[PDB]
Write a protein that binds this ligand. Structure first.
Ligand code: ADP
Length: 746
């Protein structure tokens, strides 16, 4: 026999493994890379733990894989594969913890609401209090807790009862189980500033990349050629491919592969289409819509009740109160004996369905979905804003023209649908004006855009944007995937004033670029830094850009561009006589790409800013750019920082400085120019009266280089600054430069 603490270790592993293995399909066979990103490269699950404080936060939209991530953390731990530093892992569902109001202690939490030790309960708990650094607790769906002012009081006792919310507050501070690791998953709304005081690391979960989707479908589909054919479908059906970047949609696609592969279209395009397809699928396991209508309305009523009550787990009494019989439950929407909706998005969908079709819903109540007496209305007002936003988009979608006929089957009279469509339409039409006139609110902007798209009425989008005066649209770090690109394009394409569209730090990808194209003609500037865009994406962007007279700036810092975009870049530079700014830093451009693209730059007259920071254009790259820029009349700023340029390239840039009369700022930090290259440059400055800033930091330059430059600075009175910070100068050489020309910056 073994002591009580080791027995519990083994019990807990056994239970956690058993609860995490499946979701028959094994989670091990199915789990696919879903990258974690941290705000300030991007990390796999394995590095989740690579004040103080002790809490790790995983944030992501609904359906992005947060639950499935935690369940894989559990399975990996319980079977020995990763996270072995923890002797105990305690998984909790926040929506379940919310359902207990009777107070309880840490011991009751761990033992009665997770895993009961067979023997020695008190010894086990003591062991835990004594080794908290070997414990992990996970809390899935933290946004589904209801916190108060009454739950904000200190509580350091592990044995004394209190509210679950007070326990959790104090766990997060380190007042209970100090040094135990915590992992919380949450939707982006309910991460407040009070919480971040106690977070060691905050991660964002965006969804599958384009290759993730492919791996996912290969794991789920082993029958020969089926996965290939689904990938072929996605690569021919862009909007559907874009939806699958969210893991929940990849799941639905996989689930409905038969129906999707039968037709050559019309495939689902919008979010609502996808939810109707999975509804169709479930119904087939039992016109067919009409036949199960009372069920669907009973399910929808419960869903709406749940949302209004912020209740996502229903007890058998709540279920017979809402009146959902066992045939209702068998349909597939309620699961997992207290039940919950298959996913929170199905709760939202079923409530939207109820709002569109139930005779108990007054027309006017729909105004509370869009922000603008009856029980329906009272429920909507108390609903979590992020569930209302989901519900509202589904409502808009169910009321589109595509679905007139489908819904008409369910009614004796269309009068009711007419009234709800008209109301929703009225709200949507004024929603962008309403948004801007109420003074970051841009997540909310995005949901309004989503609802407009779901409605699928071109004219409504046009009305919504009429009279706006958007110049700059900032949507950094906003969860912008491919499908949000489709929604943006649908609305923004009607703008009459060119917009600076800022989508830095999202997951646009190649599919998103494609989906964005229709509104490219409405952009004066497009910022797509840090968005996983490859050569395929930019080549398509550039082809469309050639026909967009207003587009003058493109920024693509930090993507996956290689030399294979160079020809498209050369066309962009040679053919767009309007183009002002191009940022291509932190890609994989080499000397070959730079020589190719440089031909375009030679035939360009208007470009002002060209950025290559972090590529590797090298000597031959620098050479070709320099010769192409020798006669160029507009370029004012060139950056070649960190490009592995040496003396041959410095000679070329120096020969270019002899001829060029417009470049004002030349950024050469972090290369290996050396004294010889700085001598060349210095010669050039003697025949240049236009350059103002030459940056040479971190270039292996010696005092000899500084002397060559100082000599040139004696006969050049146009240059303002020459950066030499971090070069190998002795302290004595540093002292000696300080008395000489002050335009040297050290
Ligand atoms: N990493 C993943 N690998 C495979 N399937 C996943 C992954 N993440 C999510 N899924 C699938 O998508 C569904 C929705 O994801 P879920 O984790 O419930 O999202 P969230 O918890 O963020 O709302 C899951 O039930 C599962 O079918």
């Amino acid at each position: 026999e073994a002591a009580a603490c080791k027995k519990y270790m083994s019990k807990l592993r056994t239970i956690v493994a058993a609860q995490s293995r499946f979701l028959n399909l094994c989670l091990e066979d199915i789990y696919t890379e879903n990258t974690l990103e941290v705000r300030t490269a991007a990390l796999g699950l394995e590095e989740l733990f690579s004040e103080d404080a002790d809490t790790v936060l995983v944030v992501g939209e609904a359906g992005s894989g947060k639950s499935t991530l935690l369940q894989q953390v559990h399975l990996l731990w319980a079977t020995g594969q990763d996270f072995q530093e923890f002797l105990f892992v305690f998984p909790f569902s926040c929506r379940q913890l919310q359902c207990v109001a009777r107070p309880l202690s840490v011991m009751t939490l761990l033992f009665e609401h997770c895993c009961w030790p067979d023997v020695g309960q008190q010894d086990v708990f003591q062991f835990l209090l004594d080794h908290p650094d070997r414990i992990l607790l996970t809390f899935d769906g933290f946004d589904e807790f209801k916190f108060k002012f009454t739950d904000h009081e200190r509580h350091c006792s592990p044995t004394d009862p209190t509210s679950v919310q007070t326990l959790l507050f104090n766990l997060l501070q380190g007042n209970l189980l100090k040094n135990a690791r915590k992992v919380l998953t949450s939707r982006p709304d309910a991460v407040s500033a009070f919480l971040r005081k106690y977070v060691r690391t905050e991660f964002n979960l965006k969804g599958f990349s384009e290759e993730g989707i492919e791996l996912y479908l290969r794991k789920c589909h082993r029958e020969p050629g089926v996965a290939d054919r689904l990938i072929h479908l996605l690569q021919t059906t862009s909007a559907l491919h874009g939806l699958c970047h969210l893991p929940v949609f990849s799941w639905m696609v996989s689930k409905c592969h038969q129906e999707l592969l039968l037709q050559d279209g019309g495939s689902p395009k919008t979010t609502t289409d996808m939810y109707l397809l999975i509804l169709q699928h479930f119904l087939r396991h039992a016109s067919l819509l009409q036949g199960r209508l009372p069920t669907l309305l009973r399910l929808g009523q419960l869903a709406l009740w749940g949302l209004g009550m912020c209740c996502y787990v229903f007890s058998a009494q709540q279920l017979q109160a809402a009146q959902v019989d066992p045939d209702d439950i068998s349909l597939g929407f309620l699961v997992q004996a207290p039940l919950e909706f298959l996913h929170i998005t199905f709760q939202c969908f079923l409530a939207a369905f109820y709002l569109v079709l139930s005779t108990d819903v007054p027309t006017a109540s729909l105004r509370y979905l869009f922000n603008c007496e009856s029980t329906v209305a009272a429920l909507l007002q108390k609903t979590e804003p992020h569930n209302l936003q989901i519900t509202a988009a589904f409502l808009a979608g169910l009321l589109s023209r595509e679905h007139r006929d489908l819904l008409a089957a369910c009614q004796a009279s269309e009068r009711s649908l007419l009234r709800r469509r008209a109301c929703a339409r009225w709200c949507l039409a004024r929603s962008l004006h309403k948004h801007f006139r109420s003074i970051h609110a841009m997540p909310g902007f995005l949901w309004l855009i989503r609802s407009l798209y779901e409605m699928q009425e071109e004219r409504l989008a046009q009305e919504a944007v009429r009279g706006l005066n958007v110049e700059h649209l900032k949507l950094t770090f906003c969860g912008v995937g491919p499908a949000e690109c489709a929604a943006l394009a649908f609305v923004l394409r009607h703008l009459r004033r060119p917009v600076a569209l800022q989508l830095d730090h999202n997951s646009v990808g190649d599919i998103g670029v494609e989906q964005l194209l229709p509104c490219l003609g409405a952009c004066k500037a497009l910022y797509l830094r840090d968005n996983n865009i490859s050569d395929r994406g930019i080549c398509k962007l550039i082809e469309h850009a050639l026909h967009c007279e207003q587009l003058q700036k493109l920024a693509l810092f930090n993507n996956k561009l290689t030399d294979g975009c160079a020809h498209s870049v050369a066309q962009l530079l040679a053919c767009k006589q309007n183009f002002l700014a191009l940022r291509l830093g932190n890609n994989h451009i080499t000397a070959e790409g730079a020589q190719v693209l440089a031909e375009g730059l030679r035939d360009n007259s208007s470009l002002q800013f060209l950025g290559f920071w972090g590529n590797k254009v090298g000597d031959k790259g620098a050479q070709a750019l320099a010769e192409a820029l020798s006669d160029h009349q507009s370029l004012k700023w060139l950056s070649l920082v960190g490009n592995n340029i040496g003396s041959v390239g410095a000679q070329a840039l120096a020969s270019m400085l002899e001829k060029n009369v417009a470049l004002e700022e030349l950024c050469l930090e972090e290369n290996h120019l050396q004294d010889a290259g700085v001598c060349s440059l210095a010669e050039g400055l003697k025949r240049n009266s236009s350059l103002k800033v030459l940056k040479l930091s971190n270039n292996c330059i010696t005092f000899v280089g500084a002397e060559a430059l100082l000599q040139a600075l004696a006969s050049n009175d146009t240059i303002l600054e020459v950066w030499l910070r971090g070069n190998p100068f002795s302290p004595e050489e540093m002292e000696a430069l300080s008395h000489r020309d002050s335009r040297l910056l050290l």
